[PDB]
Design a protein around this ligand. Structure first.
Ligand SMILES: [Zn+2]
Ligand SMILES: [Zn+2]
Lengths: 207, 214
């Protein structure tokens, strides 16, 4: 309960430092700046997107969920993507995963987690789509790291499959989609080099 | 359909920024990332809006690592949304979080978009939850004459209803019975001033109010 007071005191100190360090920060923040990026990341990742990316917050529209998923029938993430593309006219969409991801780890443990099961089932489906690759990695840690990367790649594919991204990219040549991995050990972003154009053509084949 | 070269240049700009940022943090503390990647479980679940302009841990002056975060359009907790319900269940049953905060903000594009008559296609069902909050409080909101004050009141009521939806979850009710945590708070962030306001939700009263029907 003392926790409440602690946060409000920190907020006041942060406002004072921000006013002293940056004169027009609140004025700029209260002024409208349209974000250039949609970032989809994990709820249990440890550093905010704009810090990692060295952007000012206001430049990144953010969605975070367990294990940075983009499931087909999830209106929560689909409404984020639709708003970002059709309302904000964002030029970049990023899916960013991270190593030491509790969401991805939890997905592999054979427990019935009731309500969590259908969410984490999406990660187990990534595992089955890439079973030969993953089963050929003998070290548990390296296998887990590869699963986090494949999960990002499949989340990226799911973004590219949205009608919002396909229609916008056809009519206007944006946005592009990237998959990244954030490594807490070094703080460095690594690009997974999802081939957007190749993936977009691969997906448009049907029709 | 070829990717314009200017979209490729933006990529390299971000990776440079990230390298510079890593250099800075290694200056301050050679073992910053070594420490960061050993840190313990977060004590707070923060539910906020996607179009809010400052991250939770900054607003709250916490180290990131201390806040498990969900952000969505208009900081909603809809009954049948497995995305947010799985965040709440994981936070309570896996992370044993002590606090859940729903934080709204004034100048919320999500809440604004909910009141504009446009057909948003796929967005209409998501923003329908905000329209439901307006219907639940129609006489209050229709009696506020200034458009800006009405919109601000809608943002506050939206946070309060998101909080009610958290307190309805079996995870929160069972944990609170067994261990007297987590507690749920509704906050508003005011970008004009940088200040948090507590909406003072009355967790225990709301928890009783909800348990009545059963
Ligand atoms: Zn994670
Ligand atoms: Zn908002």
């Amino acid at each position: 309960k003392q926790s409440h007071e602690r946060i409000f005191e920190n907020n006041r100190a942060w406002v004072a430092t921000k006013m002293k360090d940056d004169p027009a920060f609140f004025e700029k923040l209260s002024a409208g700046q349209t974000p250039e990026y949609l970032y989809i990341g994990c709820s249990d990742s440890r550093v905010p997107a704009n810090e990692i990316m060295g952007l000012e917050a206001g430049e990144v529209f953010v969605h975070r969920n367990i294990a940075n998923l983009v499931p087909n029938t999830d209106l929560n993430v689909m409404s984020v993507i639709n708003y970002a593309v059709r309302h904000l006219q964002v030029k970049h969409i990023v899916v960013c995963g991270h190593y030491h991801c509790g969401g991805v780890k939890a997905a592999l443990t054979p427990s019935d987690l009731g309500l969590l099961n259908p969410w984490l089932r999406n990660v187990r489906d990534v595992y089955r789509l890439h079973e030969q690759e993953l089963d050929g990695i003998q070290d548990a840690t390296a296998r887990a790291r590869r699963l986090v990367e494949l999960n990002v790649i499949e989340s990226c594919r799911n973004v590219i499959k949205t009608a919002a991204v396909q229609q916008s990219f056809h009519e206007r040549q944006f946005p592009v989609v990237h998959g990244w991995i954030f490594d807490v050990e070094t703080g460095l972003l690594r690009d997974l080099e999802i081939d957007f154009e190749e993936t977009l053509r691969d997906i448009k084949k049907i029709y």
